[PDB]
Amino acid sequence: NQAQELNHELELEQLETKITVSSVSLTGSTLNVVLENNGSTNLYDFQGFSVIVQYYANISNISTFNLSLYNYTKNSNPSPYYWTINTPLLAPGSQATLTIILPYPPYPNTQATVVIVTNYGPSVIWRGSL
């Protein structure tokens, strides 16, 4: 293929950004995601990230599909439907912990999907058991 053209449509930073999920752990209704920066861009514009979680919620004892978007906050103890991260800047070759506050504890033995989209475009999907 032809080399990609860098112009008004495509920024090098899109090609240079890469995140992976090292681990996901659940405590109560709190998801702690260890996010790793495997690219060469600094990540700091967290308000510009998108975070989606799909899971099965325990709503009054009923296992109920839930898919929601989560909004960023600098607050270290977020409300439900909010997430935060324990660093002001996630540099290449480092990890940070992204904390997502779910509206309900997950129903046990169900699968969940976490989607994290950087402000630059590139993203990561994690699917698994909690």
Added chain:
Amino acid sequence: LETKITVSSVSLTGSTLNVVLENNGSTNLYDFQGFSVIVQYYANISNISTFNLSLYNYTKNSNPSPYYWTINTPLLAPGSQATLTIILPYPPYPNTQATVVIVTNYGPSVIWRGSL
């Protein structure tokens, strides 16, 4: 200024999912490469109904490849509608749950929940 989008209709033929979006906000929407599009559905993979949740990438091509989406306007202005078309990797298994998530470049989003 506020950004707001709503789903007017959802329609399906084969693996082609058409979402008619209305701009009910004050902002003009045009930075489609900066949108995020996520679909959860049940794919028919060799007659097997299979959970699928994937992210879809933007293209200007009016006939996108699987895992791509496009929209049939250069700009979605307040008060107007346009069709966001998503090309799924498999035809949906009949009469199954789906969730469509469209995130604008500004942040605000819309989620459609139904069946295919």
